[PDB]
Amino acid sequence: DVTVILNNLLEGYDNKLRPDIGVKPTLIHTDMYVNSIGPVNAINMEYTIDIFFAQTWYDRRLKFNSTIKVLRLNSNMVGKIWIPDTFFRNSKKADAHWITTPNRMLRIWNDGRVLYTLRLTIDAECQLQLHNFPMDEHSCPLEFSSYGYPREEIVYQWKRSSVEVGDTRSWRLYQFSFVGLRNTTEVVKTTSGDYVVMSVYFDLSRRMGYFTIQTYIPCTLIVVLSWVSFWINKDAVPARTSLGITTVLTMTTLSTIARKSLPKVSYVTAMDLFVSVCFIFVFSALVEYGTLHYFVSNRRIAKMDSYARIFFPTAFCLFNLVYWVSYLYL
Amino acid sequence: TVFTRILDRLLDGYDNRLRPGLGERVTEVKTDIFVTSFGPVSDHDMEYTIDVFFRQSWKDERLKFKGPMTVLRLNNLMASKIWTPDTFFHNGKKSVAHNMTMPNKLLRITEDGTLLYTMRLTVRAECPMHLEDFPMDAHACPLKFGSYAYTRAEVVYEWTREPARSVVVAEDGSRLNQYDLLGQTVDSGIVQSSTGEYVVMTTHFHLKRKIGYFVIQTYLPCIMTVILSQVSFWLNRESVPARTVFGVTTVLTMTTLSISARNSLPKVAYATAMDWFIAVCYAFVFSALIEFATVNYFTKRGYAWDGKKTFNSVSKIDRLSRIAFPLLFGIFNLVYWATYLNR
Amino acid sequence: TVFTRILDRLLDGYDNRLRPGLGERVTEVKTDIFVTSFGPVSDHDMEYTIDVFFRQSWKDERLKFKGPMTVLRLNNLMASKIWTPDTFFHNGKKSVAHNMTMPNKLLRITEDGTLLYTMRLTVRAECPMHLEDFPMDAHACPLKFGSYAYTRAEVVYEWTREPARSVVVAEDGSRLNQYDLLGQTVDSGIVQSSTGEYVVMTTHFHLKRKIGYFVIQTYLPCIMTVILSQVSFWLNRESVPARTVFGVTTVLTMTTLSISARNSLPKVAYATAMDWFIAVCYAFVFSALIEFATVNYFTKRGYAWDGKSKTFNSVSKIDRLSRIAFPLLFGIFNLVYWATYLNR
Amino acid sequence: QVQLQESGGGLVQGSLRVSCAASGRTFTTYIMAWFRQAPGKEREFLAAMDQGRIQYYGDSVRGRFTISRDYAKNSVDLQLDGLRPEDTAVYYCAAGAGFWGLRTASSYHYWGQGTQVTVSS
Amino acid sequence: NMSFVKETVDKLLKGYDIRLRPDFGGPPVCVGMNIDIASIDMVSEVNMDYTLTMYFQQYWRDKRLAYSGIPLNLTLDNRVADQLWVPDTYFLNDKKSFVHGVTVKNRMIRLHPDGTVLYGLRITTTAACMMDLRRYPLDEQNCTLEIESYGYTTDDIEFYWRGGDKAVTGVERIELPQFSIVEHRLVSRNVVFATGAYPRLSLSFRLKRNIGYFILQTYMPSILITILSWVSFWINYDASAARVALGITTVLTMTTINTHLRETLPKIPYVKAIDMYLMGCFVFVFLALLEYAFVNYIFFGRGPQDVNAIDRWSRIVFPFTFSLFNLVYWLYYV
Amino acid sequence: NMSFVKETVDKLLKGYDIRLRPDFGGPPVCVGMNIDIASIDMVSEVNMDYTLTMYFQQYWRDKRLAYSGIPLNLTLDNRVADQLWVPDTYFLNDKKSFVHGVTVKNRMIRLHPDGTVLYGLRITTTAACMMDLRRYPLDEQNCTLEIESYGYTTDDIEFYWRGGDKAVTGVERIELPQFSIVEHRLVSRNVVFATGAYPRLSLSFRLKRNIGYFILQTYMPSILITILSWVSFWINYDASAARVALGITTVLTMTTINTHLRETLPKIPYVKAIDMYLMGCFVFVFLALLEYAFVNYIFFGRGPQRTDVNAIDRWSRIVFPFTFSLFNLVYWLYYV
Ligand SMILES: *[C@@H]1O[C@H](CO)[C@@H](O[C@@H]2O[C@H](CO)[C@@H](O[C@@H]3O[C@H](CO[C@H]4O[C@H](CO)[C@@H](O)[C@H](O[C@H]5O[C@H](CO)[C@@H](O)[C@H](O)[C@@H]5O)[C@@H]4O)[C@@H](O)[C@H](O[C@H]4O[C@H](CO)[C@@H](O)[C@H](O)[C@@H]4O)[C@@H]3O)[C@H](O)[C@H]2NC(C)=O)[C@H](O)[C@H]1NC(C)=O
Ligand SMILES: *[C@@H]1O[C@H](CO)[C@@H](O[C@@H]2O[C@H](CO)[C@@H](O[C@@H]3O[C@H](CO[C@H]4O[C@H](CO)[C@@H](O)[C@H](O[C@H]5O[C@H](CO)[C@@H](O)[C@H](O)[C@@H]5O)[C@@H]4O)[C@@H](O)[C@H](O[C@H]4O[C@H](CO)[C@@H](O)[C@H](O)[C@@H]4O)[C@@H]3O)[C@H](O)[C@H]2NC(C)=O)[C@H](O)[C@H]1NC(C)=O
Ligand SMILES: CCCCCCCC(=O)OC[C@H](COP(=O)(O)O[C@@H]1[C@H](O)[C@H](O)[C@@H](OP(=O)(O)O)[C@H](OP(=O)(O)O)[C@H]1O)OC(=O)CCCCCCC
Ligand SMILES: CCCCCCCC(=O)OC[C@H](COP(=O)(O)O[C@@H]1[C@H](O)[C@H](O)[C@@H](OP(=O)(O)O)[C@H](OP(=O)(O)O)[C@H]1O)OC(=O)CCCCCCC
């Protein structure tokens, strides 16, 4: 019965030939369920996505007449049917799944419409603009097209309920958060013909709770640790010197981990600008005490204790106002 | 020679692209899992490796034989020429069908056509973790598996013996560093897709982290850093560089401990319990050096005291801090280690 | 057209499961290696990487033809259709036969049945090391390949030409960070496995470590730390916190250098040469602080000499002795160390 | 201190099993070898076995002598056979790491004392 | 000569069902094994596993391969092992294994005129260990390799170590950089499951760790840093910055040593022996600074209300206490 | 429309021998080459490699695949590339590469009715290029890719870049986080190996290292630590616990810079050019500490024997910033 149908569908079927090979571009309707956007690699500029990638097309060499009306088949038929060579244009480690069987499926209705759905995991590249670090946002794309068939041979098209987001609460979005979804349709011009490139965009805003409890709080409080010296006496020169130089050593230690939190960009990020401003503050405090101790003891400066007690916390709060407002809101 | 004829009778026209009882019934597949070694739970990927014997049995009328044996034990080569259900793991990342030295699959046909198709898998299964009590937490890591092409009205999965006695772990193969296994919980559910409705088995594992690592690597170093900062209060008040060195190094020590205790965690964007403890202990140490600045505003006498003019007092906020800071630190330890050891 | 039926006539009466002349004589396989690039020698894994174009040649009487050509330069699919010796590297760990973009194998058939079969391999080979003169050592890293199933009675290996000229290391492919390549040594051996005797070819690549990285990162830091911990004597004896901070910090510096230099290495049970150097330099910096404790036992006053002149302290006697004693002992140790180990 | 102490006789009509029982250092990694020194200041490489059970033989002795190590007892055992009168010489037990080795005497940094084995025909 | 051999091989395998155990309704096959260990590559405490390279070999008498007339043993190409029966032996301790691929897939088939066939594999596996690191790094580690038939039960297949105690060879040739193999045992036992009783074999070592590496790296600088904590006793109570700086710098040095050892080692819940020793040395170092706080408080605080007697007593107490602690420590574990 | 196409394809593949190149006794086959680069993923100085994801295309004509009648360029499924001849080109620089396999293997076969066939792969390779680090981190290391047939000599196969000035496209749209690709050169040549002469193409792109990571990480804190070593010239000579602790913590900070800048890097056996600068800055700090040892021994040691402290201090304040300016002068004019 059904075996007779399947053997009639493969009697003279050639999977090397696209449907409508000299007739018209084969319109393919692509559907996609996103299970999880995994951990976004800020260093390698990647992200893991886990999709259920569905395709439909009309294959009019697969018409049949029956009462069965639908052939809900295994993955075993996939190698016997023309399957569109949909690759991902910005993938780097694109895996299918193979446990326990191939995770493909195939459903053929009587008119020639073929459902095809497979599970994928994709380390997809996105160019991370790491200005406003760590206060930025990205739209990390995910593209696909056919590899060998041009626009004149395969045209892709979204369905209506195109990209179906899951429940968003079992994802591994650590520092980021899902805020947007935006599909598109465009045509690239490669050397070997022109192709129809679908693309999904994922708008991602940022979460501000990691770098608060790692870099902001320790760098600011160790700047205040340097300020402790100004309530501490002028006579005890080794104590003040130890305060200043060990806080310098502490900032030099923290600057390493501040750059370690990011791929080695060739400019200065906003995080590292803050760290560098903090290091210049501790530098200026130690140079201030050296100038103080030379002008007084080694032979006004006699109020420059009390001048620095007022100037340095106020200048740091003015810099906090300028930095935090201009790099959060502006 | 006889059994070769039997197997050739079985594989006469056997289309392995048809569910057994395709238009007749709904296929009842009996699954069973034997966990050999519940492997290392990666926090930094939020996953867990598990190594299972994955049994699944069903009834196939197309494979009836009447020969000398009731049950014939097969090579796995015939198991590619026979329908097997497309059972996949929903929360599976990158899992291993073992192929040493052969593909580790068995297939046993009883004479009434009831198959038993087991394989050995190493499964890097996903587990979403709530780290709001890190590291005084429990977890519920699932094993979600169903069929990929067949719906609820085509295949139905069950458990073989009982629900609660199916997923049985081994007794010798624990293979957990940080975690207790506080028993498993099985459950059957239904996942509705746009393509249809799908029978989905689940099995939750209940993992509690053993606490002693972070006790001896994070908690006790921060406790004794605070005690080391409170050592400075039992000096005099004239030794300005001495108490300066005490306070500055203990602040530096708390910063180092803060970073090197966070490094054992995924970058969650909120405060864990360890974050609360390290921040409060950092506040104690920082308050101690603010206290020395408070004393050093009041100094007035650069000379120390002799064993034999005027001299300098004991600066009674020294006494008040010696009573206060160990008392406040001990009260906070009581509050901490009675709060989070019940959540 | 013609070559299609030539190749069909070859594969008519052919089996690729049994040795050419299975019951008649041995199969003389003439092996050859072209080392393109001798890759980096991982000390921590005690391994190295080598990439070689692996030539083999033998004579198969069943593959005689006559036609318009002498040699048939062919596709590797027919090389998979023809008997091929199961050569395996005896000390390979995880070795990769490259197949980008096609399997990099050439089969050439000359008309008298003399096959040529070269592969393109990357062999992550296992080089056992004797690191007792670390880093000033040198050792032979071997590369040993034999058949897996055929004994001496069945397949015998040779080299195509004379052995020390057969294995060729190309010049552009250095790919070494630390070591230098002083030359190879081409030979031949026999094993006595339970299954039977086998013919084992052997090349021994000879590698002497450049110590420039280790001098820069370990020796000059330890030397200059000791120079510091001996500069402490030229302060006066009354600056107790100055010399105290000085001595214990140089001790911390030597402890830091100790662990961070031993990290670049496996975890062998003896002590290497750099361990002897670090331990002796750490003993100097330890003895400097014990010396200052010995000074401070005999201080007897609290102040030092003012520039305008009560009693005073003299510069102590063990200070004046140690100013000359410890740098002289450190110079003697440097002479003995760098004359002992640059001999081997 | 490393000692490479031999045994076995030194006079024959025959066959002989000349052993070399080491102490002080495990030479499993090392290539333990036997050298023949004829009168004429000529150390000749007879036989050597690698750590991976690989027998290397000299050209004059290929097919006559059998070398066999016991890695438990840290020994090397050159079996003698087909003894010509030209084998009257001194047999050294050697050990080393063969840098520029297995064919040279300077590559070995550990030595036996030697044994004269004399053939009377 | 040779066409007779091809004819004999082709009439062996025509009419040879490879999905059938030998004597398929009758007695179990006695599959005999043989392991020739090449090396053990790494023994990782971080991942609790070890890499084992071996020449894993199997004998069994397949009665359907018994040829005649040819006086030699048929050593064939490795690709004819696809056209035979082979046992489905696996490893339970295995994480990620591979038969080597260069230059071919390293198999051998050596047929015999009685029908005996040898199947040899060069397998580089990665077997797991439940490492009990409480006595680290002064421990004897036990690590196994559990060979077991997958599908065929004990009624279909029997495993014997061929050679008794001399099946597994090449153990004595292994020179691990930081271990030392004491014993290997060879256990043959049947294992029950839900599906039946299967034959299990067990090659199983005992890795004893060499102890000198940690004396060089960790123990000896810990001893010398704990000794240099005691320079403060030979410094006046007046010199405050001196005793405070050495006491602060020695708690910093012990901190750096312990941070390095926590970076090396896995995430274990208990307290290891090297951690017991560093906790003990840090107790001595911390008490060597509590002593100065005690002296400073007694002199400058309880002054107007002995001092040098504390130093004279502690110079005798602390070396005696430290030697007593090392005595108890190194007699508990060694 | 379909039966005729199927008849032409099955006529082409029938009798087509894939063990033979085109013109197997005749002329060498001319293979066109064409690369579109997706990205250069990483360039590791540790592993001396660079990961390269590209679109790799090969034209050649094949007279056994010439079909008449149909005006199409027939694009077949990629599973027919196992049934055709292809040039077995390898990459000599290759360590580890793979053709991507989602959702199928990325091949194309675009048969043209004169026998020309495009065969395009999608390759992520990990090629190895040596890195002369004598001018790190100001170096402009050159990395090359070498494309070459394996089994066919120069008399069997010939390569060429197609449009040899503009064969490699997409060099500009590579955005490396550390490097800027200044230029790329296409060079065709042969080699001579022992078996024969083989045609080889080279796709090498020069790479200037951008230096802003090192100004922010290494150079500027070395300058500021070197200057903070000189606070202890405007400190009185009696303050031993000031000047000594200042210079000691300064050499500690230079040591902790050296720790991370030896951790980040390969173990090359010479002076990295980042080591000339840091060793020179360590010498300045070391001489700033030797100055106090020199002052203390002159004043407190050569004092009662009875030339100045303040003269040496004033001389050091004049000399050491001038000396460090000369050092930066020589350092930033030697390399740039
Ligand atoms: C590392 O860690 C592993 C795991 O802990 C250690 O492995 C264990 O080693 C011991 C000692 O070598 C093993 O015991 C031996 O078992 C064998 C096999 O016997 C089995 O098969 C028999 C049939 O062939 C069967 O009769 C046996 O059943 C008996 O024992 C069971 C026990 O439950 C009992 O239920 C039955 O009623 C029987 O009484 C069993 O199934 C056995 O042959 C050995 O006996 C010899 O040695 C003993 C003395 O030790 C002697 O009394 C006997 O006469 C005989 O000479 C012995 O019992 C154990 O099986 C291993 N366990 C595992 C899980 O592998 C290993 O030793 C550790 N160290 C090292 C260095 O590797
Ligand atoms: C990175 O590093 C690599 C390697 O160092 C650089 O690659 C080198 O690039 C240069 C070009 O910039 C190459 O030089 C070219 O070589 C080819 C060879 O062409 C051949 O065919 C000729 C016939 O058509 C034949 O005559 C040639 O034979 C000559 O040269 C060989 C040696 O190659 C010699 O043995 C013979 O005796 C002959 O003398 C050869 O077989 C050549 O075509 C180029 O010549 C042209 O351009 C020059 C001007 O540049 C002009 O004068 C000529 O008239 C002609 O127009 C050119 O000489 C060099 O071979 C490459 N080396 C390697 C190892 O590949 C790469 O450039 C670097 N890139 C970066 C980032 O800078
Ligand atoms: C974080 C702590 C913040 C503390 C902030 C505290 C800020 C603050 O203002 O302190 C003032 C004082 C500490 O002063 P302190 O004891 O250090 O200094 C004495 C004080 O100046 C006296 O007035 C002097 O007495 P007199 O005139 O010569 O007779 C005495 O001189 P002498 O004896 O040397 O001759 C000085 O030593 O404390 C309180 O009064 C209770 C505060 C309880 C605070 C309890 C805090 C736990
Ligand atoms: C690690 C070394 C350990 C050495 C342990 C050595 C322990 C030991 O026995 O020290 C004693 C002595 C220390 O002498 P040092 O110069 O340090 O101290 C002088 C000494 O105390 C005089 O007795 C004092 O004068 P006086 O007469 O009382 O008025 C003098 O007072 P002042 O007038 O200046 O104020 C002090 O300065 O050293 C040696 O004799 C050389 C030993 C060389 C030993 C060399 C060993 C290498």
Helix, strand, or coil here: B62? helix
Q: In sequence order, what DSSP letters do the residues of A188-199 get, joined into one string?
A: EE-SS-EEEEEE
Please state, in angstroms and rounded to a whole number, the distance separating the CA atoms of residues F119 and F62: 12
Report the C-alpha dihedral over residues A312, A317, A323, A329, rounded to 10 degrees.
Answer: -170
Q: In this complex, is the C-beta atom of B103 within 8 Å of any C-beta atom belonging to chain A?
A: no
Substitution target from A11, A16, A78 for chain F, most F beta carbons within 10 A: A16
Q: What is the DSSP letter of C313?
A: P
**Alpha carbon of B183 to ligand 1 centroid (Å):** 30
F235 exposure class (CB count in 10 Å sphere: 0-12, 13-18, 19+): buried
SS3 per residue for E50-107: EEEEEEEEEEEECHHHCCCCCCCCCEECHHHHHHCCCCCEEECCECCCEECCCCCCCE
DSSP reduced 3-state for B19: coil
Return the H-helix or E-strand segment holding A186.
Answer: strand A176-189
Report CB contact under 8 Å: F248, C260: no
Any binding-site annotation on E150? yes
Helix axis angle, B317-339 to B273-296, nearest 10°? 180
Tell me which chain E residues have a C-beta less than 8 angstroms from the C-beta of C286. 224, 228
Per CB-CB distance under 8 Å, the chain A contacts of B281 are: none
Beta strands E207-209 and E140-141: pairing type? antiparallel
Q: Which amino acid is at E130?
A: M
CB E109 within 8 A of CB C104: no
Contact: B286, A39; criterion CB under 8 Å: no
Q: How far is the CA of E302 from the centre of ligand 3 (A)?
A: 19
Q: Transcribe F214-242 into DSSP letters.
A: HIIIIIHHHHHHHHHGGGGGSS-TT-HHH
Per-domain boundaries in chain A? 1-207, 208-330
Per DSSP, what are the bridge partners of residue E189? Answer: E200
Edge-first strand listing for the sheet containing A138-146: A86-87, A138-146, A194-206, A176-189
Helix E240-264 × helix E220-228 angle, to 10°: 160
**What is the rounded distance in angstroms from the CA atom of residue A283 to the CA atom of residue F228?**
8
- The whole-angstrom separation of Cα D52 and Cα B335 is 64
Q: Across the interface, do F234 and A17 touch by the CB < 8 Å criterion?
A: no
Annotated binding-site residues of C for 4-aminobutanoate read 55, 118
Give alpha helix (H) positions in B105-264. Answer: 212-214, 220-230, 240-262
CB E77 within 8 A of CB B87: no
CB B117 within 8 A of CB B56: yes
Q: Is E200 near ligand 1, meaning CB less than 6 Å away?
A: no
Determine phi and psi for F215, rounding to 5 degrees.
-70, -40
Give, using CA atoms, the residue closest to atom 32 of ligand 4. Answer: C313
The secondary structure of residue A212, as a DSSP letter, is I
DSSP letters of A246-302? HHHHHHHHHHHHHHHTS---SS--HHHHHHHHHHHHHHHHHHHHHHHHHHHT---GG
Give the whole-angstrom CA distance, residue C36 versus residue E259.
Answer: 43
Please report, for residues A28, A51, A145, the alpha-carbon distance to residue A94 in angstroms, rounded to integers and kept in the order given: 21, 11, 14
C-alpha to C-alpha distance for B131 and A210, rounded to whole angstroms: 13
What is the separation, in whole angstroms, between the first and last Cα of chain A?
70
For tokens 């301790």, what's the residue? E93
What 3-state class would DSSP assign to A217? helix
F163 φψ region: left (φ > 0), alpha (ψ -120 to 50), beta (else): left
Is the CB of residue F65 less than 8 Å from the CB of residue F113? no
Q: How far apart are CA B216 and CA F107, in angstroms?
A: 56
Alpha carbons within 13 angstroms on the beta-carbon side of residue A312 total: 26
Q: Is residue E263 within 8 angstroms of chain D, CB to CB?
A: no
CA distance F233 to A293: 11
Peptide bond into E195 cis (omega under 30): no
Instruction: Report the gap between the CA of D120 and the closest CA in chain C (Å).
Output: 32
> Where are the alpha helices (H) located in chain E, listed in sequence order?
3-13, 212-214, 220-228, 240-264, 273-300, 308-332
Q: Which residues are within 8 A (CB) of F185 and not within 5 positions of it... i.e. 6 or more apart?
A: F202, F204, F205
**Based on the number of CB atoms within 10 Å of its own CB, is C4 exposed (0-12), middle (13-18) or buried (19 or more)?**
middle
As for ligand 3, residues whose beta carbon falls within 6 Å of it are B 291, 294-295, 298, 312-313, 315-317, 320-321, 324
Cβ(F154) to ligand 2 under 6 A?
Answer: no
d(CA D34, CA D19): 10
Q: What is the resolution of this structure in A?
A: 3.6
**B277-281 CB contacts, 8 Å cutoff, 24+ apart:** B277/B218, B277/B219, B277/B222, B277/B336, B278/B218, B278/B222, B278/B254, B279/A213, B279/A217, B280/B332, B281/B222, B281/B223, B281/B225, B281/B226, B281/B254
Q: Are B211 and B233 in contact (CB under 8 A)?
A: no
Give CA–CA dist A328/A134, Å, rounded: 10
D6 within 8 A of D13, measured Cβ to Cβ: no
Using an 8 Å Cβ cutoff, are B110 and B71 in contact? yes
Tell me how far apart the alpha carbons of residues C335 and C329 are, in angstroms, rounded to a whole number: 10
Q: Of F139, F145, F180, whose CA–CA distance to F161 is shortest?
A: F145
In three-state secondary structure terms, E266 is coil
Q: Any chain B CB within 8 A of the CB of E48?
A: yes
- Alpha-helical runs (H) found in D2-79: none
Contact with chain C for residue E328, Cβ under 8 A: no
Which residue in chain B has the smallest CA separation from A246?
A: B248
How were these coordinates obtained?
Answer: cryo-EM
Which residues does F331 contact at the CB level (< 8 Å), separation at least 6?
F276, F277, F280
Q: Counting Cβ atoms within 10 Å, is residue E71 exposed (0-12), middle (13-18) or buried (19+)?
A: exposed
Q: Which of C3, C98, C214 has the CB atom closest to F24's CB atom?
A: C3
Phi-psi label, residue E201: left if phi above 0, alpha if psi -120 to 50, beta otherwise:
beta
In angstroms, how far apart are the furthest CA atoms of chain B?
A: 118
Radius of gyration of chain D (CA): 13
B262 CB within 8 Å of a chain A CB: yes
Q: Can you spell out the DSSP letters for E217-238?
A: IIIHHHHHHHHHGGGGGGS-SS
b (16+ CB within 10 A) / e for F252-278: bbbbbbbebbbeebbbbbebbbbbebb
Q: What is the F161 CA–ligand 2 centroid distance (Å)?
A: 15
Segments of C186-284 assigned E as strands: 186-192, 197-209
E7 touches chain D (CB under 8 A): no
Calpha distance F99→F105 (Å, rounded)? 7
Mutate to test the pocket of ligand 2, among F129, F187, F203 (most ligand atoms within 8 A of CB): F187
* Residue F20 and residue F152 in contact, taking contact as beta carbons nearer than 8 Å: no
User: Residue length, chain B?
Assistant: 343
Of B284, B297, B313, the one to substitute when testing ligand 3's pocket (max ligand atoms within 8 A of C-beta) is B313
Mutate to test the pocket of ligand 4, among C236, C238, C311, C316 (most ligand atoms within 8 A of CB): C316
For residue C104, the chain F residue with the least C-alpha distance is F150
CB contact under 8 A, F118 and A14: no
Q: Do B235 and E301 form a contact (C-beta atoms < 8 A)? A: no
Residue E165, chain D, CB below 8 Å: the answer is: no
| Helix, strand or coil, per DSSP, at residue F151 | coil
CA-nearest of A125, C303, C199, D20 to F174 is: A125
DSSP letter, residue D66: B
Contact yes or no for F253 and A249 at CB 8 A = yes
Considering every ligand atom, which ligand is closest to the CA of C320?
Answer: 4
User: How many angstroms away from the CA of E192 is the closest CA of chain D?
Assistant: 37
Q: What are the chain D neighbours of E175 within 8 Å (beta carbons)? A: 26, 28-29, 51
To the nearest whole Å, the CA of C263 is away from the closest chain E CA by 9
